Amino acid sequence: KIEEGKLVIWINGDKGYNGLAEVGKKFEKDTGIKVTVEHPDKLEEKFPQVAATGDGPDIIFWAHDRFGGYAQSGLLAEITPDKAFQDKLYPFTWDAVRYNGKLIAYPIAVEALSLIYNKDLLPNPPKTWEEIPALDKELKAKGKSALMFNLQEPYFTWPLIAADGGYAFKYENGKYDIKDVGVDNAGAKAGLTFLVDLIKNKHMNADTDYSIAEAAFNKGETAMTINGPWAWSNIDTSKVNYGVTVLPTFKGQPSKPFVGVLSAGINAASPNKELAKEFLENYLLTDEGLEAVNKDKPLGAVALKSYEEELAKDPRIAATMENAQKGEIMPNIPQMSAFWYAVRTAVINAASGRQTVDEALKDAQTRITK
Numbered sequence: 001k002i003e004e005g006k007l008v009i010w011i012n013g014d015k016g017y018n019g020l021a022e023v024g025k026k027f028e029k030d031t032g033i034k035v036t037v038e039h040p041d042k043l044e045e046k047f048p049q050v051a052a053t054g055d056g057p058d059i060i061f062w063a064h065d066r067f068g069g070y071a072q073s074g075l076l077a078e079i080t081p082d083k084a085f086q087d088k089l090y091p092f093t094w095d096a097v098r099y100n101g102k103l104i105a106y107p108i109a110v111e112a113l114s115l116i117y118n119k120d121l122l123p124n125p126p127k128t129w130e131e132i133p134a135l136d137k138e139l140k141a142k143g144k145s146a147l148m149f150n151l152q153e154p155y156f157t158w159p160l161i162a163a164d165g166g167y168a169f170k171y172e173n174g175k176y177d178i179k180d181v182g183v184d185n186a187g188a189k190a191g192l193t194f195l196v197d198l199i200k201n202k203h204m205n206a207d208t209d210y211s212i213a214e215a216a217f218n219k220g221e222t223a224m225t226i227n228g229p230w231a232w233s234n235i236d237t238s239k240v241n242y243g244v245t246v247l248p249t250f251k252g253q254p255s256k257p258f259v260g261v262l263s264a265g266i267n268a269a270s271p272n273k274e275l276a277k278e279f280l281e282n283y284l285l286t287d288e289g290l291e292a293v294n295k296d297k298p299l300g301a302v303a304l305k306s307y308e309e310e311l312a313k314d315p316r317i318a319a320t321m322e323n324a325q326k327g328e329i330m331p332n333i334p335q336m337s338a339f340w341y342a343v344r345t346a347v348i349n350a351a352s353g354r355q356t357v358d359e360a361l362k363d364a365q366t367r368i369t370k
């Protein structure tokens with residue numbers, strides 16, 4: 001089901017697909033081949049399924065953490081750029097899309113969660129997690145709340161779990177040791193207990209998801225939320241007077257978000273590798289290609305140095321870079337998806353009272369290490 005002569009791109013629904021569509025149109029305008037951009041639900045799970053058949057998109061966008069597993073299944077072409085092109089992007093973004101010494105994708109953007117706050121309702125954001133219960137009780141007196149964020153997805157809670165010492169896989173020599181997993185140590189247990197105490201004492205609800213939290217913030221019902229740059233767009237249309245700052249510390253330690261590098265990989269089963277390379281290197285990864293996407297939903301701190309130089313004056317980009325620096329670049333090993341599924345279950349079970357914190361995280365460590 002090759003087709004040929006066209007490009008099909010999958011990208012997640014939260015990202016600037018309509019912008020990327022613009023960039024596709026221009027490529028189609030001066031090259032003649034059509035580019036259809038789609039955003040299937042559950043594309044990152046679908047990809048290893050369809051592309052296994054020899055079908056699916058020519059180009060697949062997702063954070064880099066999924067890209068080791070795809071590479072291990074031989075689903076991605078090795079990419080090949082001259083030293084000149086490589087010099088156009090930041091080096092650490094290349095490291096993230098290397099699997100077994102090979103490059104498996106092009107880096108586009110560096111993503112890190114920030115604290116987003118309603119300046120009108122809250123001139124100074126808290127410096128610490130510990131001062132959030134008190135802040136909530138003040139605000140509830142006026143029918144507002146302190147903080148709502150998506151609790152269904154472990155990506156949003158990880159920064160608190162990691163803060164006092166939790167980790168995914170220990171980095172040994174050049175390897176991650178997949179048997180040394182830090183989701184059940186004292187640091188992780190401290191962080192998840194805190195969150196669970198926030199819910200027990202009605203400072204937020206176990207059921208809050210991405211939509212609930214986004215609506216509460218953008219209507220001015222909650223003073224704070226935790227999200228990444230793709231969310232800024234929807235806030236601007238609400239005209240809420242917002243700032244974007246460092247995440248609060250916990251026990252004196254910085255919150256530590258897992259940093260994701262938005263990457264684009266070429267399906268090894270594509271009859272269109274050359275057209276794919278062309279589109280990416282010469283259309284998308286230019287100041288003009290990147291701004292068209294950014295205009296639709298912001299990318300974050302972008303991998304292309306020339307555009308980042310223009311973006312870096314923005315205090316939002318500055319905050320994004322400050323949280324990224326306190327955080328850690330995710331592994332891209334195949335075991336990352338196993339990690340995520342276990343942790344997701346642990347958080348949801350702990351937050352809902354189905355399990356104690358200690359039970360939840362012990363299960364997760366057992367599930368991850370086999």
Ligand SMILES: OC[C@H]1O[C@H](O[C@H]2[C@H](O)[C@@H](O)[C@@H](O[C@H]3[C@H](O)[C@@H](O)[C@@H](O[C@H]4[C@H](O)[C@@H](O)[C@@H](O)O[C@@H]4CO)O[C@@H]3CO)O[C@@H]2CO)[C@H](O)[C@@H](O)[C@@H]1O
Nearest residue numbers: 014042044045063065066111153154155260337340341344
């Ligand atoms: O089991 C039901 C759930 O399973 C599916 O979600 C899985 C994904 O398949 C895994 O890849 C992983 O997801 C990670 C993701 O790989 C990682 O990048 C990060 O995702 C960010 C993204 O970087 C960022 O750009 C923005 O889009 O937000 C994403 C988080 O929403 O974190 C994810 C973990 O939160 O793990 C999940 C299970 O957690 C399926 O897609 C789900 O819809 C389903 O709930």
